[PDB]
Structure formats: C-alpha cells, structure tokens
Design a protein around this nucleic acid. Structure first.
Lengths: 384, 703, 604, 198
RNA sequence: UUUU
C-alpha cells in the first residue's frame, strides 16, 4: 500500500460528530451523535452522488458512538444482515437490514434479543464475531463501564426466522478495584482482548473464558495518563496491535499472542521519544493480508506502517477543501474554530470487490470519517 | 552431472513439447533452485503439485524453497503433512528438523525469544524420535542439535526448560580430547552440585563429539563448542580442549579463516603475540570479514594500547559503518580517555544500530543513561529525560531475558524503576537480587558482603514504602540501620538518610506512632539540612497536627530561610501553612512578599501557584475584592500559558491548546470540550474520556 | 455519586416521537482548604527525583563474536529409469557481504527490490604483507606498527506453439524477431515509429511468463513509463505487471516490471534479489541522445543469465553497437532493420493560401513545384494565418492536425489566435466536461482552481489544446488521454510530444525548421525531422500522411530544405562517462577494477 | 588519462589514500548519486548544518537540482542562515574548482558555469513550500513555470533520501531526524499527485 | 531560447 486515490466523499453527511464507521459487502454504515444511522450503497455507478444512494434511520435521542455490521449467508439461499449499535445512554440495539423487491429501498427492522436482566447494564464497546471455522455459531462480545466482558451466541433459527441471543459467560477485570473497559476485539483463532483506562490489556480464551496474559504498556507510572484506545488482532498472524496514549502523544505497541511478549513500537520524528502520532491515535486497521497497518490520528493524518520492518510507508493528509461539491464544505465549526486539518475518528479497510465505482473493482479500498462531519473513500492504485 | 544451468533450456524445450510432464517440471524446478532462482522454482513446484497432487517429493522441494525465501509457516505445514503421509523416509524427517532449526534461529535473530525455545524443544523432541525409532545417524542431525542447544545457553532465563529426559536417551542410543575436558555421559549422570548452565554447556559438548574437509569441520565444531563453554564458565580445561581441537583442525586444513579466528580467541590472555598472529592470518585469508578487525581491536585494548585500537577502529568504521561494534569500541576508548559527550553519542548510536541484537549495547546504554541523569538536577516534567529512562528500562528488560542474575544490571534496573514509579517490577527484581546475594555470601562465608547488604535492604525498604507495605519497609529499614551504624564513609550517609526517611514516613502513614516519627525526623534534621528535605519534614510535622510539631516545622523552615536565603518553594509552603492557620499579620506580610517576586522567580513558576495564592489571600482579607489583576498581568507577560486563561476566558484556553500550540492531556482536553456547554462538544468530551464524571454528568443534565 | 450512579441515571433517557443542538443545565462553576492541602501540604508515598538525587548512588571476552558452525555435507537425488522419478538419495560432501556469487544466501530482512550498499552486487557477465619477526606476524596490513603492551553479431536480410497470437498477419521483421527470440538469444530491431515494435516486447513478456520468469522494461524518459504501464495493463490478461519509481512501488511481485534505466542501474550496483529471476531486459528508445541515458553501464553490469531486446529507430550505426554488446557479454544478437512505413508521407509547402507538393510518395523531389513556390511568394506567422489554414484543412477534411512550435510561449500565443473556431458538438462537450471533472477529483478545491487548469478546460471544450514542458504533469496526462480518445482536432506541441506516445493524426505542420537548443539557433537535424514528420498517418483509417512546411512571405532556401528533409540520417553516439561516484563505488567493492571497466567499452 | 587525473584529484582531497583505499569521506560520497558528490559530502561532513532547521536544509539543497538558467533578478534571501549556507557552498565550490584546474581535468558546461548562473533563485520557493503555502502562492512568487517547480521538488525528495543514508553512515542522528521530517514535509498535494494512468 |  503506497498510493491511494480518492474516489468519492460526502461532506456534511451527518448533523453531529461521526464517531464510528463499519462496512459490509453491500453497504457502509455510519453512526453519529445526532442519533441517526446511515447506510451508503457500495455499488455506485459512474457520475452518482454518494448521498443519492443513502438511507437513514433514527435510533436513539442520546446519539450513537459504536457500530458493527454482520453479513452472512446462513442457509442455501437465506441471507441475513445485522447492525448492532450502542448509545451514550448505554443501550445495546439490534437491527435487521433488508431491501425491497421493486424499489430496492432499505428497510429497518428492530430486534429484541436481550432479556430484562441484561438491559440493566451500560455497554460501551462491541464487536461481531463471525463464523470462521472455529465454531459454527456467530459470536458477540461487549464491555461495560464496570470492566466486565460479556460473550453471547447468536441463533438466527429456532427455515424459520426467530433470532435469539444466548449468554456464554463473563470475564471480570484483572485488577482490584475494577477499571473502565474501553476497547475489545475477537480473533479468528478464538481469543479475546480487552483494553483498560490504566494501560493494561488482558487476553482470555474464547472457549473456556479464563485469563491468559496481563501485560502493561505504560511508558511510566508517574501520571495517570496512557489509556488504551484501540486493540486489534492481526487477520492471520499471532499479533496484537495496541494504541495507547502518552501524556499528549500517541503510541502504538506490537505484541505476539502465543506467549505475550513485547515486540516493538512504531514511531516517527515529530516536533524526542517513541511516538507514532503528534496528538493521539484513535483507531487502527489491518489490511486483508495483515502486512500493512493504518492508524488514524487526532492530528489529522492517516499513517501507514510496514508490520515486519516497523517503518512508516506513507502519509495521507485530510483537508476540508477535499469535498467535491463545494456547497458541502464545512470550513468552520459552530464556534468558528478552524477545520482545515480535522482529526480522524475512525478508519476501516474494505475488502476487494466490496466497493465499486471509479476504477475500484480489483483492489482494496479504504474509508474514514473525520471531524468536519464527512465520510471519504479511497482506493489503492494498481490491482491484485 | 551437477551442471544445472545447462539443463534449464532442455527442460524448457521438453515442457514446450509436452506441457503435462510432471517430471520435466520437477527437473526444471530443481535446476532453478541451484541457480539462485528460488521464486521461479517455487512457482514451478506449485505448477507440478497442481498437475499431480499426490506427488510427494515436489512438496518437500517446495518446502525447502519456501524456507530459503523465509516462509516458515507454509513450509512447516507442507513438511508436517508430508511426514504424516510417509514417516519411513529419512530425508523428509531431516528436512523437517532443518526447517524447525532455521525458523527458531530466525525468530531468535528477530527478537522472538519466547517462541525460539519452544521451537527448539520441538526440534529436540523430533531428533529424539528420529534417533529412537528410525535408528538413523548422520552428521547433519547432530549439527542441527548443537545449533539448537545454543539457544538454551543464549536464552539463560529459560534454561530450566531444557529437555534433560529426551537428551539422555539421545545420548544413550548411539579419546584424545577426553582426557582434558573429562566430559563423559557416565560422569554427566553421576554428578552433583552442578548448576543448570554448566549442565547445558556439557550437553552442548556432546553432539560435537558424537558426529580432510569433514574431519577439519568436525574438530572445528568441537573447538567452537569448547570455546563457548570456556567463555560461559571460565575454567582452564575448556580452554585447553579448545586449543587442542583448534590445533588439530588447523593441522587438517589450515586454509580457513574461522579456525584462525577461534585460535586467536582461545589464546587472548596466555599470549598476545599468538593472538595477533592468528588474527593477522585470519584477516589475510578472508579480507571481507569485519569481525577479525574488531577482535584485534579488543586484543589491543586488553593490553592497554589505545592508539592501535583507535586506528583499527577508524579503519573498521570506514569498512562496516552499519555494524554496532566499532561504535561500541570507540565509545569505550573515549570513556577511558575522559570525553563524556562524545562517549554518550557513540553509545546511543551503537544502541540504535544494534536493534536489540547486542547485550553489551543495551547494558552500556543503560549505564550511560543512568550515569548522565543521576545527579543532574532535572525535573520530572522533561519529556526527553523520561523517554530516555523508559528506553533504558526497556533495554534492561530485554537484557534480563538473556543474562539474568547480574548484580550490576539488577541494581541499575532497580534505580531506573524507582525513578519511573514502577514499584511492582522493582519488588521482584529486589527479591531476586537479595536471593543472589544471600546465595553468594552463604558459600564463601565472608563478611565483606555486609556493606552491600545494608544498601540493598535500604533500597528494598524504599520499594516497599513506594508500594505501600509499611511493616516490611520498617523491618528492612531497621535491619539496614542495625547492620551499619558505626561506619563513617561516603556510601553510609546516603543509606542512613534513606533509612531515616523510610522509617519516619512509614510510621507516620499507618503506625500512628507520631512520637517515633518525630524522633526519627528530628534525628534526620540533625543529620542534614536541604530545602526539599526540610520542606518534606515540615509538611509531615504539620500533618501530624500537634502544636509543638507545627511550631517546630515553622521554626525550622524560618531557620533554613535565614541560613540559605529566599526560595519560591519554601515561601509558597509557608504561605499555605499561614492560610491554613489563619494568621492575619503573617498573611498580610506574605501578601506583601508574594506580590513583589523577581522575574526570575516568575519564569520558573510555570504553573502560576503564586498568582493563585495571591488571589486566595486577597479574597480572604478584604471581603470580596477582585484579584483578577494578577491574572491579567500574568497573561500580559505569558499570553501562551494554559493556566492564566482559565480565570479570564475559556474560549482562548480551548483555542490555544486545540491545534498543538501547547501539550495537553486527554482528560484536560475533554474538560475543555465539556466546558463549552454544548451537546456536540459534550458528546465529544465524553467520547474522549468516558470515565470522566463531569462529562457524563453534563450529558445527563442536557436532556 | 460514582460513575456507576451517573451511568444508571443515563438509562432513564427515553426515546420519544429532527436533531436539536441542546444546552446543558449543569453549572460548572469554604472548601478551598482542600485544594491547598492537596497541593502544598500533602506528603506522598512516591519519593520525587529531588530526594532520589540525595539517597541514590550509582553502583572483553563477552564482547567478541564466536564464529558459527560449518556444514559441508548435503543430499543428492538420483532418479532411475525412463521418465525420471526420484529413487534414492546419498549423503555426499556465503552471505551478501562476503560473496559475489548468485548462489549466496538470501537475507529476508532487506528489500528484495531496491537493495542496500551493505550488499555486494552480483558478478557482471562476460567481463607481500608478511612482516614477520622471529617467526610470528607483528604488523597488520595497511599500518606501520603492531601492539605495544602497556560472441558475434549477425545481420538478417528481409513457432508451432506461439506464446501469443494476433488477428492480423505479422510483418516479416516481426516474424524474424519472434523466431530469433524463440531460439533463445537476443535481437536488435531498428524500424520506423508506430511500425509494430511493441509486438516483439509483448511476445517477450509472454515468453517470460510461460517459463515462470520475469521481465524488466526500461525507457530513458519517466513520462513514457506511465503510458506503457497503462498500455500493458489493457493489453495483457493472466499476467500481472508492476511499476517501479524512485519512491512508489506498485505490484513488486509482478511478472513484468516497468522502470527507468537509472533505477535499474541503482538496483544492479546494490545487488537486489530481484535480478535473480529476471530473464529479459528491454531497452526502448535506444536512439535517444540528449546532452539518465546510462544504458551502456547497465549492459556492462548485468549478470550472465539476462538476455537483451533493444528497440530503436532507423539509424545507420546499428551493427557497431550490436557487435560491441555481443563481444562484451558473449551473447548472440541479431540485427533486424526495416524502412517500410504503413502510411506514405507527402511533403507540402504552404504559401499564399496554396498547398504545393514538393516531395511525392516515392520520395522524389519536384523542382518545378519549388520554382512555382519561389516565384509565387515574390518572417513568422501573423494574427490571421492560423485560422486560414485551419479553415482550408476543414474544407478538405484534413483534421486532426498537429503543429510543432519550439517555444513555450508561442504555442499558447498561437492557440489564442484561433478564437471563434469550434470543433465540438453538444454531446462531445458534455463528455469532455464529464471526463475533466472526473479526472481532477483527487485534488483540492485550491488545486482545482489553478489558472492553468481553467485555461486548459476552456480550450479543451472546443477541440483545441497545447502541449509543452511548462505544464503540470496531470494537465499533460489529461491532454494526452483526451487526444487519444479522438476529441482534440488542433494541437500545438513541442518536442515533448514527438517521442513514443499514442498519436492518431492525419496532418503534421512545421512552424519552422530551426530549433534553438543549448547555446545558439540550429537547423533541425534529419533524425529529428524524420521522427516528428513520421507521425502524420493513421494505419487503416487514413490513406496518406500530409506534411506541410510553412513559408511566410519569404521563399525557403533550397539548400537547408534539402539538408533537413532529405539528407544523411543521424548516427548512434556513445554517452558513456566517468564519475567520481562510479570510481568510488568500484574501489569500495574491490572487484571489477576501473581500468577493466573502461577498456570494456565502445569508446575504447 | 582522465581516470588517472581523477584518481589524483581524489587522493589530493583525502577521499582516498596512497593505496587507493576508500576513506570516510569516500564512503559517504558513495551514497550520493547526483552530479555533485564531493561538494555535498564536504557540506554534510562537519557540524555546519547543526543549527539549521529541516526547512532550511531542504531549501538549501535545491542548488544541486536547479539549472539556474533564468532571466530575472533574484529576490533577497528569506533567512540569514540560507545566505550563510550559500556563502559556504560557494567557497567549497571555488576550492573544488581550484583543485580541478590544478590537475587539468576537462569540465562540463554545467560544472564550469556553476557560479556564473542563478542556481540559488529557487531557495525561497522550496522554503515556502516546506512551510506549507499553497501552490497558487508558490507559483505567484516563483521565477519559473509549474513544471520546473514540480521537477525541483521531485528531485529534492531523492536528495533527502540520499542525505538520510549518508547521515546514517557518518554517525549523525540529528541530521537523520531532520531529513526524515523534511521528507515528510515536502511530499504533499498536487506536486506528488497520483498519475492519471494509475 | 527546446529537452531534463
């Protein structure tokens, strides 16, 4: 991944901050603080505004900050697409996405999968675990404000549609008193990683739900900075990338999950020390092959790293004037503050063939949401 | 006929005539491999496998090629499947062992020291299986075993994992040099009082003896193993055996550089002329090797000839600028001479170039960083110093994985972790150090070790004080004070002061025996007088609450002020004490004092504690007078200060810290977002710091 | 109220039946002693560095590197019988910084594409100290003291299972080149531009792909690399191609890699592992001569398993260079030359609104027509001459036309004199607008609004464009693509546009026959004119190629006209040079001494 | 004879010794692949560039990539350190010309007229591009066309790479960090836009 | 006053 070309964008897509983004083969999902959920069609034609092929639905008045989509072919012909979101109030909501036969419009259907006793908790993070030959049932993992990780199993059928969520168990925080669980991830090999606000990461086994490792990524414990913002597993390898703060700096550390030992860190010279970004790292993403890592920075840059050599490859700069339609450009916010270099909230790699359009048919894509309330799409030059 | 390049065209023509010949594809791939065309051979083997999936040798050749290009996972899977399909073939098993060993060595070189030992154990298990079942013996498998056994000696923190059960059966299912080393299987089995590392090295020297080019290689391998044992254990018989083996190997061929390098290494101290001649011969044999020059430099340095070492290191730097050894040698030379800045720069360059592959680079970098920042008078707000300490701590953590139980490195790491507030790792490190010292002093039955014992106990008490174990801290402080009380030297006063501080603070915090704390702090004040020490003692005495304690604290603070002059910290502490004690005359005097500080005393006060104190005193003496004028003056002098704009305008404060003008943390930035009292900004600030109470409370209070 | 209570209070927020930016009801604004006590009079468990400064005190065999073991035994496979299958094995009896061999070990840490100076190169293809005292050495080499303790080229006159097939019937020279490549050696083709030299390169790439090897395509101009990359992307199926630049690498593990000559030379001098699998290196535009052209050094430095395919224009010095290469590298190379052009070219002179032919199809000069020209006339273009010629060619349907002007300013000046002439319909204008809009979507609004882009867009939407070296590369690429699409009718170009590029044109017009290069005005050499005037006919869509040389109120000299239009063509010249970087690298490598490299050269 | 004279010049400047062994200066000059290796090697060998900023160093190195065949009056320099570096480079080049003329080596047209052309006329443009100005303002203040500026910056990228490697060889880490920062700073926008054929 |  060396050359990235912008293919489409949509400024002023949402009315508030777009905190997360997710993609599937059919569409891309965005959640914002205004309480809406927008579905963007991935199969665009030449000379088509992205906002023309978009559909929105209102979920919660308090806004949404996490989103994940699960798409799979559950039977010979049955197809299910599920969207899970969590709100600022702490509610976990599930929606089924389907399309009309004639108009081809997207329909939203709300699902009820949590019992009354399960609705008393405040969830923060979530992640869909799809079937990857590890076990025949899909998985859902979430964290709460008390530090506990929950694991479920989703059963679509009881072909008869009757979804049901079955709780497998819970994993508690490794330290007393409990801390805030800020991020969570699940791998294809059956591992769960959880990040905490004190800088501690815990890894537990999916099958038996018992802790394995407890490594501490803090540079120094002089101050109470250095919380964990993002934890990501490598798609095929035994590698775990950690994004953590360092007293106004952003750091990335690499660990190997077979034995849990520190491998190294990614850093570049910035206006000394070992820091990857100037402000903070808010998101991380691996490509399909697991050889390139993308970090979204609060400073307004997308940096691409070589995993094996731990060296930077290229940098993408974000500007408010990159929006095609000039009437959608948001130069200043509601307080007159500049947005010429807006920070990135989330970044996502799209698989080959997911996103079609201006030459993006045979190579990997990329999507990001920024502070100017915009959503942007890129494509990798060349083919594969 | 081994004329591989000549058959490429013939195989290509035969393949053009018939594109479905599997043997033509196999021959073309095996010809490409010997011509350095590894990727083309990989593709050819893939093609042949696609034609005939049941072909067996094609998968083995593909696995070897994948190992050559460095793809260990796919080759390991292929070879495991092949060995499962047919376990009778010896070549397949040997190739699997080879790939396992190469993968382990590559992981070791790449820094994956925890999986290297596991793969080495797997390789040893496979070798045991081969020897026990197939009853097949060859030189290659023993060389592979010896290469694997070096991983356990190199990674000494994981030496207890060595499979001593499989190795016994490996050495029980199969004389000139035996009289020197006396290393035998029977002597190995009937041994006692032998350390783990010694047994590891003795196991290393049995695969070399259980395996004229071939004989020369055999004797050179035995000599290399004995040289490794001599370096690791420092016993003369290993040196004699190594020299004997090197002499025999030289008498066999005498046309290889490595034998001369080994002979020069084994005779470094017995005679320097012999080592010089050996290194010159080795350099003349192979001029493209940069190790001989470094060995000659080290030999010259061991004889205290600095000019020769400097010249050879200059030549070596001209030769191999990317290697980290010449920089280490130059740094050592400059440290011996007396230059300090250049030595630090060279140590840093060596550490950066090493990339974790050198223990010595890590150790010298950590020692230099500790030396340069032990009494430098620097604060904890300097990013560069804290980052240097963090890098030194990481380097020492990497160092302890290969060579643990080192006293000097353990003490340096203890000091670094004390500076870094990592009180949990320091506890384990100090436990290991105490155990090592106790083991060392319980054998020689000496008494000179009691001096370092007291210092280690004092450090261990400080670690407990930091962790919060007041009882153990008091016990260790008492032990250290008792062990050394009549001594009068430079290293005793520091330990005495540290023990007094630990005792007083530990009693005050939990024991509530304020009389003992008062006695110890009085003794400390009698023994020393420094600004920070007297300020800490005054704060502790004030926190006690006794009227006599407060009087003593104020009196000794004023005495220090009279003796050493005026300082901002002491004045601020006195002002705080007066404000908490409600002394109107003292408050007015301090308000007169605080409002006329020199500019030097205002540039230093980066957190504007003084203006806050002036505002607090002003509002507590003149009803409700507005004291914002000091904030306006401070903003006039310091418009780019984050603290001054808090009292004047939060918009300016949010804007200034927004885009990198000042360095602001996530909690502070989240506080700035929420203070605009807007739904979007409140959501932003709660997303940044979800555990903040004010953010969630404001979001709840919105609607 | 801890965080748990606050988060429990949040769940009471019930959804009701547009977004509104709400304002909180919380008020952010004598317990002031708690802050003072916590800030100025709070003892702590963690001792600051000030106290550690007072209570803390700081407290050759292992620096060596023992040589690694050695293994001299290996395995050999002995097949048996017809259709050889592995029957038995027997036990029978070097890094990048030590050996020059191709069989040295591969280190996976370094780049396999670029390399490093820490690696020695591979062996190029086809190219006392004992101061003993009492029996033992004491003086190392290079010092004054010890330790004091203290093979031919052939000319050809003009496959059962071909690796590539084409619909049309191949030319004789194409068939000869394909046959000689199939036989397994080198070729050296010298033919006119747009005569079908790309067929040879395509067949070479297909042959390499069949044999599971790789190909390298080099050109001395970086502008041609992108065009060739797009062309081979569109042409080729089942084979992947890549592009290597100074910084960007696209598909590094591709069968075909396109780069420049300097990148290949830098790769060669640093021993990149890429050359291990490379079978062909193709040298295009060999005839190019400018005072980046370092292809001879590449020829010298290449390994011995690499073959050569060299594509060039018609020059009379081919055999000398072919023989030099064959003798130097011990390679068999064949020389194929063809003067045939698919579209005949006719030379005309424009004078007094009249086209007067002076050289017919058979390259025969016409003295009577030149005399007619000279007498009819009895100096540069004016503000009313270009529209007249444009209308004249529109009346006779002689578009598209290309005018070559050898100055940046005069091209733009001439294009502005065509105001009031339009060549596009409504649909054509809409399509051009759409393409321009879709091309510049990767830039910012500030970049999209540059005056050059606006001016070019104004010109492009009428069928008129200008091509010269002072434009932005994106503007030049847009102009070239739009011209290839067939939308542009009138174009003013410099010599940049006369090199290997797609150029469908029906008429070529020369503003002048004098070019100012270096120091001093100079009349065009026959090679420059032949290359520039040789692009005036489209194969299969045009019958003849019209070439017009313009005279403005003054007759053209017959001597200069004959010298430029019909004269002895230019010859190939050697551009080999000596540089301090070259000598220093050779001295550092300590192999292939500089004298040997110099003596193995065309000049010597 | 040209090779012998070049060897004599290399030995006279302490790049090699009497035995033709490559010295430290000769090792650094092996990595520079522009047309002026010796001048750049002696510019970066000592600690002259210690006080400079990354923008100042990247703007100063543009003399080695700009042909200088313009026809306008140069504007005054933007920073004093750029003028100091210009003086240093001119003095080094005068000394090199003296050395070359001592051994009677035939020079090229560009080497002979290095100081007779306006090769320092693009320092301001490169400095302002590194600072972060837009291309419209850069073109408004430039004395050349768009293609010339694009070519100059594209070549300065490779110059920065070479200086990174040379600084790694020398033993200077501050120069390495400054070169990395400058390389990140200059690579942006329309100058380094993706090709329309990709 | 082209090419880079």
């Amino acid at each position: 991944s060396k050359v990235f070309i912008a293919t489409a964008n949509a400024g002023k897509a949402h009315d508030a901050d777009i905190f997360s983004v997710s993609a599937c083969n059919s569409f891309t999902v965005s959640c914002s603080g205004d309480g809406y959920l927008k579905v963007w069609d991935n199969k665009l034609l030449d000379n088509e505004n992205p906002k023309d092929k978009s559909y929105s639905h209102f979920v919660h008045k308090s806004g949404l900050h996490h989103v994940d989509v699960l798409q799979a072919i559950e039977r010979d012909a049955f197809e299910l697409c599920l969207v899970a979101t969590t709100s600022f109030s702490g509610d976990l909501l599930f929606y089924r996405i389907t399309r009309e036969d004639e108009t081809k419009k997207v329909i939203f259907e709300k699902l009820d999968l949590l019992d009354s006793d399960m609705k008393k908790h405040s969830f923060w993070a979530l992640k869909w675990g799809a079937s990857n030959d590890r076990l025949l049932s899909h998985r859902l993992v979430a964290t709460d404000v008390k530090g506990t990780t929950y694991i479920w199993k989703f059963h679509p059928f009881a072909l008869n549609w009757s979804p049901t969520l079955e709780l497998q168990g819970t994993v508690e925080s490794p330290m007393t008193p409990s801390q805030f669980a800020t991020s969570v991830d699940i791998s294809e090999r059956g591992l769960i990683a959880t990040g905490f606000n004190n800088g501690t990461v815990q890894i537990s086994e999916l099958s038996t739900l018992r802790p394995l490792y407890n490594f501490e990524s803090q540079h120094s414990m002089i101050n109470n900075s250095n919380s964990i913002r993002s934890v990501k597993f490598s798609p095929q390898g035994s590698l775990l990338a950690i994004a953590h703060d360092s007293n106004s700096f952003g750091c990335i550390t690499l660990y190997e999950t077979e034995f849990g030992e520190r491998i190294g860190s990614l850093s570049v010279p910035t206006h000394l020390g070992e820091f990857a970004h100037s402000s903070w790292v808010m998101s991380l993403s691996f490509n399909d092959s697991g050889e390139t890592l993308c970090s979204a920075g609060w400073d307004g840059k997308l940096r691409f790293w070589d995993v094996k050599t731990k060296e930077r490859i290229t940098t993408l700069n974000m500007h408010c004037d990159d929006i095609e339609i000039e009437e959608d450009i948001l130069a200043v916010d509601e307080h007159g503050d500049s947005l010429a270099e807006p920070g990135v909230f989330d970044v996502k790699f799209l698989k080959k063939g997911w996103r079609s359009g201006m030459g993006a048919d045979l190579n990997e894509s990329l999507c990001c949401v920024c502070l100017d309330r915009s959503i942007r799409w890129f494509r990798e030059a060349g083919g594969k | 006929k081994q004329e591989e390049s000549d058959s490429i065209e013939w195989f290509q023509s035969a393949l053009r005539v018939d594109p479905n010949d599997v043997e033509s594809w196999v021959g073309l791939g095996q010809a490409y491999h010997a011509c350095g065309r590894i990727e083309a051979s990989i593709k050819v083997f893939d093609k042949a496998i696609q034609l005939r999936p049941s072909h067996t040798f094609a998968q083995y050749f593909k696995a070897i090629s994948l190992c050559d290009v460095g793809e260990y996972l796919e080759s390991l899977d292929i070879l495991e499947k092949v060995c499962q399909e047919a376990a009778t073939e010896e070549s397949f098993q040997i190739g699997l062992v080879e790939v396992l060993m190469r993968c382990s060595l590559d992981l070791y070189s790449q820094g994956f020291l925890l999986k290297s030992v596991s793969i080495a154990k797997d390789t040893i298990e496979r070798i045991k299986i081969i020897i026990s079942e197939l009853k097949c013996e060859n030189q290659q498998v023993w060389i592979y075993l010896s290469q694997v056994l070096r991983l356990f000696i190199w990674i000494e923190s994981k030496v207890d994992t060595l499979p001593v059960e499989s190795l016994v059966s490996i050495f029980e299912n199969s004389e000139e040099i035996d009289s020197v080393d006396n290393i035998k299987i029977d002597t190995l089995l009937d041994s006692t009082t032998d350390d783990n590392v010694s047994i590891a090295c003795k196991f290393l020297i049995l695969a070399s003896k259980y395996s004229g080019t071939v004989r020369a290689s055999y004797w050179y391998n035995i000599g290399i193993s004995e040289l490794t044992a001599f370096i690791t254990l420092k016993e003369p018989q290993y040196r004699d055996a190594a020299i004997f083996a090197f002499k025999k190997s030289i008498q066999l061929q005498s046309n290889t550089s490595e034998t001369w390098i080994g002979l020069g290494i084994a005779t470094m101290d017995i005679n320097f002329r012999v080592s010089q001649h050996c290194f010159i011969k080795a350099t003349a044999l192979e001029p493209k090797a940069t190790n001989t020059w470094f060995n000659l430099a080290m030999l010259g340095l061991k004889k205290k000839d600095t000019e020769f070492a400097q010249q050879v290191l200059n030549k070596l730097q001209s030769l191999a600028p990317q290697d980290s050894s010449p920089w280490l040698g130059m740094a050592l030379i400059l440290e011996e001479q007396g230059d300090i800045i250049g030595s630090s720069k060279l140590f840093a360059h060596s550490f950066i170039l090493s990339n974790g592959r050198s223990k010595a680079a890590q150790f010298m970098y950590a020692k230099n960083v500790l030396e340069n920042h032990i009494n430098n008078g620097d604060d904890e707000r300097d990013i560069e110093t804290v980052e240097k300490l963090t890098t030194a701590s990481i380097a020492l953590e990497q160092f302890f994985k290969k060579s643990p139980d080192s006293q000097f490195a353990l003490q340096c790491a203890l000091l670094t972790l004390e500076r870094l507030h990592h009180y949990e790792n320091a506890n384990e490190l100090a436990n290991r150090l105490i155990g090592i010292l106790e083991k060392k002093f319980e054998k020689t039955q000496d008494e000179r070790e009691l001096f370092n014992f007291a210092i280690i106990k004092g450090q261990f008490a400080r670690i407990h004080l930091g962790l919060g174990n007041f009882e153990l801290s008091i016990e260790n402080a008492d032990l250290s004070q008792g062990i050394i009380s009549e001594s009068s030297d430079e290293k005793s006063m520091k330990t005495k002061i540290s023990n007094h501080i630990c005792l007083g603070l530990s009693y005050f915090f939990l024991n509530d025996f304020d009389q003992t704390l008062n006695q110890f702090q009085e003794l400390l004040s009698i023994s020393k007088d420094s600004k920070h020490l007297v300020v800490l003692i005054a704060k502790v005495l004030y926190d006690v609450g006794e009227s006599d304690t407060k009087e003593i604290a104020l009196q000794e603070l004023t005495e220090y002020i009279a003796t050493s002059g005026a300082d901002l910290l002491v004045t601020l502490t006195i002002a705080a004490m007066s404000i908490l004690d409600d002394k109107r005359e003292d408050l007015s005097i301090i308000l007169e004092e605080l409002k006329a500080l020199p500019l030097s005393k205002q540039i230093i006060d980066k957190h504007k504690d003084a203006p806050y104190l002036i505002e607090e005193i002003t509002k507590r003496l003149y009803r409700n007078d507005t004291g914002k004028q000091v904030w306006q003056r401070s903003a006039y002098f310091f418009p780019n200060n984050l603290k001054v704009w808090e009292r004047l305008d939060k918009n300016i404060q949010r804007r200034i810290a927004s885009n990198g003008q000042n360095k602001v943390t996530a909690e502070e930035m989240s506080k700035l977002y929420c203070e605009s009292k807007n739904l979007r900004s409140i959501q932003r600030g709660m997303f940044l710091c979800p555990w903040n109470v004010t953010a969630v409370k404001a979001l709840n209070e919105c609607f | 109220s801890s965080i748990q209570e606050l988060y429990q209070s949040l769940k009471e927020i019930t959804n009701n039946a547009l977004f509104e930016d709400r304002i909180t009801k919380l008020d952010f604004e004598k317990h002031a002693n708690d802050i003072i006590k916590d800030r100025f009079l709070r003892p702590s468990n963690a001792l600051p560095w000030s106290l550690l400064d007072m209570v803390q005190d700081v407290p050759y065999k292992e620096l060596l590197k023992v040589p690694d073991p050695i293994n001299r035994t290996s395995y050999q496979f002995k097949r048996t019988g017809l259709e050889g299958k592995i029957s038995g094995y027997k036990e029978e009896v070097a890094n990048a910084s030590n050996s020059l061999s191709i069989t040295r070990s591969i280190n996976h840490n370094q780049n396999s594409v670029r390399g490093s100076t820490a690696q020695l190169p591979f062996t190029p293809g086809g190219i006392l100290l004992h101061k003993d005292g009492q029996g033992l050495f004491d003086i190392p080499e290079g010092m004054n003291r010890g330790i004091k303790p203290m093979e031919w080229a052939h000319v050809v006159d003009l496959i059962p299972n071909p690796a590539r097939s084409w619909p049309f019937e191949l030319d004789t020279f194409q068939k000869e080149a394909v046959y000689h490549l199939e036989q397994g050696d080198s070729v050296f083709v010298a033919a006119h531009t747009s005569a079908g030299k790309t067929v040879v390169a395509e067949y070479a790439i297909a042959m390499a792909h069949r044999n599971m090897t790789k190909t390298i395509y080099t050109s001395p101009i970086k502008a041609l690399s992108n065009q060739k990359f797009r062309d081979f992307k569109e042409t080729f199926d089942d084979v992947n191609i890549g592009l290597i630049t100074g910084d960007v690498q696209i598909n590094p593990d591709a069968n075909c890699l396109i780069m420049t000559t300097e990148i290949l030379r830098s790769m060669l001098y640093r021993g990149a592992d890429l050359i291990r699998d490379v079978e062909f290196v193709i040298f295009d535009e060999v005839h190019y001569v400018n005072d980046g052209v370092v292809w001879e050094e590449v020829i010298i430095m290449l390994p011995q398993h690499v073959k050569f395919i060299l594509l060039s224009a018609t020059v009379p010095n081919t055999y000398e260079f072919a023989n030099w290469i064959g003798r130097t590298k011990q390679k068999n190379i064949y020389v194929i030359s063809t003067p045939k052009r698919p579209v005949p070219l006719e030379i005309n002179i424009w004078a007094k609104k009249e086209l007067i032919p002076v050289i017919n199809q058979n390259s025969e000069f016409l003295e009577a027509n030149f005399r007619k020209h000279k007498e009819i006339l009895n100096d540069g273009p004016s503000k009313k001459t270009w529209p007249e010629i444009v209308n004249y060619l529109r009346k006779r349907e002689l578009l598209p036309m290309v005018v070559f002007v050898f100055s940046k300013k005069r091209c733009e000046e001439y294009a502005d004199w065509l105001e009031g002439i339009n060549f596009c319909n409504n649909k054509e204008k809409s399509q051009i607008h759409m393409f321009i809009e879709k091309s510049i979507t990767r830039l910012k609004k500030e970049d999209r609004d540059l005056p050059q882009i606006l001016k070019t867009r104004s010109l492009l939407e009428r069928g008129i464009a200008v091509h010269h070296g002072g434009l932005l590369p994106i503007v030049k690429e847009l102009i070239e693509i739009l011209f290839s699409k067939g939308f542009i009718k009138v174009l003013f170009a410099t010599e940049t546009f006369a090199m290997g590029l797609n150029l469908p044109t029906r008429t070529v017009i020369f503003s002048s026959i004098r070019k100012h290069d270096g120091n001093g005005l100079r009349e065009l050499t026959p090679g420059e004119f032949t290359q520039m005037a040789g692009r005036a006919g489209r194969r299969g869509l045009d019958s003849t190629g019209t070439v017009i040389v313009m005279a403005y109120n003054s007759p053209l000299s017959i001597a200069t006209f004959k010298e430029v239009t019909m004269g002895v063509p230019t010859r190939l010249q050697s551009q080999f040079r000596l540089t301090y970087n070259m000598i220093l690298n050779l001295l550092r490598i300590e192999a292939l001494r500089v004298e040997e490299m110099i003596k193995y050269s065309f000049s010597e | 004879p040209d090779y012998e004279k070049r060897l004599a010049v290399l030995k006279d400047t302490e790049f090699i010794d009497q035995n033709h062994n490559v010295l430290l200066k000769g090792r650094v000059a092996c990595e520079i692949n522009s047309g002026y290796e010796l001048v750049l090697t002696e510019l970066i060998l000592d600690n002259f560039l210690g006080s400079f900023e990354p923008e100042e160093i990247v703007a100063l190195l543009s003399v080695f990539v700009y042909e200088g065949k313009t026809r306008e009056e140069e504007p005054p320099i933007v920073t004093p350190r750029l003028a100091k570096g210009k003086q240093r480079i001119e003095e080094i080049y005068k000394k090199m010309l003296c050395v070359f003329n001592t051994h009677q080596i035939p020079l090229t047209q560009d080497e002979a007229e290095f100081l007779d052309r306006k090769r320092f006329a693009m320092m301001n443009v490169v400095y302002e591009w590194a600072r972060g100005l837009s291309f419209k303002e850069i073109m408004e203040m430039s004395p050349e066309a768009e293609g010339t500026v694009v070519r100059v910056i594209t070549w300065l990228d490779e110059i920065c790479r070479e200086v990174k490697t040379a600084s790694i060889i020398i033993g200077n880490s501050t120069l390495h960090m400054k070169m990395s920062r400058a390389q990140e700073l200059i690579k942006r926008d329309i100058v380094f836009a993706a090709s329309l054929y990709l």
